[PDB]
């Protein structure tokens, strides 16, 4: 139990960043939820169902993460294997569900572009409902898995560095899941760009579409890439406590993503903009 | 025959009206009705609710 | 009421010149695109040319592209078609047509069911 | 207030049943694509209708044709029970997916009338969002007329003389250069109006169809797919 | 011989103009200046009716001022309770291209019609409880553009074949045909005494017809472009016409000439719908600019705007008691206003 490394100035920086990013995330996601729930036409379509799922996931992740992170790294906590893993699952479910909601939005937009004449038939409101309910079920199952098994000292495993009661197998499984989801998301958005450019510019022989997708991708990598890279480095024991003194900061990036996701997904929507400006 | 029918219709519209009545009486009737039945309860769409 | 009274035309030599005029009353001439259509014996109405609200988008049918010149005078509320190098194929009756609605780029004026905003016509024999 | 409560309950139950029926009808209204068929009498729009009927009926003026491609439903309406003054009823077709526009390209005398109709449709206030699938029917007749001579197209279109076939053309293998020039001149005559207004909110999709052509349903399907793809791409805060 | 008829028609028109000028010794705007202006009028949408898939093309209130029928291009004829917002009925139409719908004064029947050239009459109050089509009136050779009930047995329908027709519903035959218009008849209005009706057409003219005689009692001109909305004043001595030239005009039947003009420089969009308030002091006109404007019909000053529709305001109506104004648009939503 020595994962409590923080210079007092660095501790202050962690507390400040956590508090401000959490407040920003909760305000933005609450506003997004209110806007999507104010109008029936918005909640009619599956895309805004997925966006609302993302907003709920970001809200929960922000709240529970800014609860647990200061609780550990600042207000040094006694903790316990079956309750610390409860908090860790509480944040893991939220972040996995956020990635899954991004995946659902990406696949929904991909079908609307890959098969535009079957989009209104391939995916419908019951199908979107069952899809996101099953996504949340999978996320919560993965978050509950370490409570039952997947432990390192309760299951006699090699264990890891960052999380005291987690297994390298669990880190590998979660990294694989999130990496596959993000790879599909980036493939979907790159495919949308490629099809627009095959159409749009080339077929007629766009500035905001390409910029929007580039912003989405840059946010996605700049928020989920350093984190996963540090996790993969630490799983293999690449280096020493030098890495884990910035994983506290790099994890804050996720909060920033939870702050930015409403802006580039809900604020950048014409129908949501109209609904917000109507009230 | 179409010209004959048009001329007959024009003759009918000329005779027996020749623009009966004047604008003074017509406008007076119109605004008198729009004023008499402009009671607050009578026409809810006006300023009164 | 709207009225398009045509004047000019008649009997001309096969190769001469003529000028058709169209006096418009009952509406603002400036807000409407104007047309010249014609109906020759044995066939229905055909659109000869048109001119926009201001007079900057003049267009012609191909058969009169180099000869006829359409021009409007908003102050006089008049529409002129200057015809020259006339051929016997121009022996039609020429109607001054007006587009149905103002400030629009679309017109349906060739209709044979008595389009309302069309003049009486002038016989132009060649 | 027992009677009032019972009346309110019955009204709410009837409203709920009607709203369920309305949802059922909505699930099929959005599953079909409406198409407006336009053209002159000489244009074989009825021929296209029958050809895709081989792949539905109308007797009250409007001829309705229902066909399917790749499990997608298309409903096409040929309004043939009105007068020739269409400036009013055509506004009914503002939510139509596309306007099929059939042009008899064989006869050059009525080609300017077709061009003017295309201009009015393209520049209409209520049709400036609708894309047009332009079918240039009777290509074999145009080929025979061009090759037989004595039917010069320059008489009706002087600018044809100062026109050369586009470099990015796709002539048929056993096709004369002259007929290729003529038919691409007609297509470019329509495309001049097409690519002159309506910046990006709708596109024209020219096609060269003969009297017999079994690919018309697939061409409409592909063009509607492109139209819906552009609509979806415009949902990303574009306009 | 045609020249003689043309000259006779020209001299008759000149006589008409001279008589009208002689009778036009004053204007409605001159002596109404002393009248206190109606003032700025705000009326928020009290209800929003949302059950239509496609654009709403017409509506009609009921004579009980509570039930209202609306038509949509999806092929539905929903009857709404404007109070509780509940959908009383939802009639699926044979042809989705319907441009008009009517509510019988008794309420027992609902008429509709459109591009099918057929006026379909549905019996609302059947013994079995279901709404079924009671009659299909055919005989118009153009699209049907307006329907109005004289009673449970007589209906006047205007069509795009430049003619109006009064039908006996029991026999299903054209009792009489009114043929004086040159363009498509776009809207009609029955008089309060239902002995006359005015029809505005696509010839930029309106016509007063008498139902019994079947003759064009009067003809009114003055619109630059075609009329697409018309309605009587509450007393039946006047009517209003909205046209594509972005103006409304108030004509008086007795004076035989135009009385007032409602227009503005920034308004360059054609009026789609016209109706009057209960007293006639207010003229509500729905335009193409997605808005509805309220006009002081006596002063011709725009007093009130019914903004809130996202598309063209196709249809507009005011209840018999004047409590509510229902405006339907091309965004598939009706709005009840007061
Ligand atoms: C299951 C794993 C693989 O999930 C992750 O690592 C994800 C990506 C979800 O990020 C997290 C970041 C921080 C937290 C904390 O609660 C926390 C971190 C350090 C300390 Cl000392 C105490 C608490 C949890 C998750």
Author numbering:
A (entry chain R): 106 to 310, 338 to 411
B (entry chain G): 6 to 54
C (entry chain N): 1 to 126
D (entry chain A): 9 to 63, 201 to 384
E (entry chain B): 3 to 340
Sentences from the study reporting this entry:
The G‐protein‐coupled human cannabinoid receptor 1 (CB1) is a promising therapeutic target for pain management, inflammation, obesity, and substance abuse disorders. CB1 also mediates diverse pathophysiological effects of endocannabinoids like anandamide (AEA) and 2‐arachidonoyl glycerol (2‐AG), and numerous synthetic cannabinoids by coupling to G proteins of the Gi/o and Gq classes. As the most abundant receptor in the mammalian brain, CB1 mainly distributes in the central nervous system and exerts regulatory influence over cognitive functions, memory, and motor control by modulating neurotransmitter release, which is regarded as one important target of mental illness such as depression and anorexia nervosa.
To obtain a stable and homogeneous cyro‐EM sample, we introduced the miniGs/q protein and employed the NanoBiT strategy to stabilize the fenofibrate‐bound CB1‐Gq complex. The CB1, miniGs/q protein and β1γ2 were expressed in HEK293F, Escherichia Coli and sf9 cells, respectively. These proteins were purified and assembled in vitro with the addition of fenofibrate and Nb35, which stabilizes the nucleotide‐free complex by bridging the miniGs/q and Gβ1γ2 subunits. Furthermore, fenofibrate was unequivocally identified within the orthosteric pocket of CB1. Specifically, the benzene ring (Ring1) of fenofibrate engaged in π–π interaction with the residue F1742.61 (superscripts indicate Ballesteros‐Weinstein numbering for GPCRs). Of note, the carbonyl group at the C12 position of fenofibrate forms an additional hydrogen bond with the residue S1732.60, which was also observed in the CP55940 binding pocket. However, the α5‐helix of the Gq protein displayed a 40° clockwise rotation compared to that of the Gi protein. This disparity suggests that CB1 adopts a unique coupling mode with the Gq protein, attributed to closer contacts between the α5‐helix of Gq and TM3 of CB1.
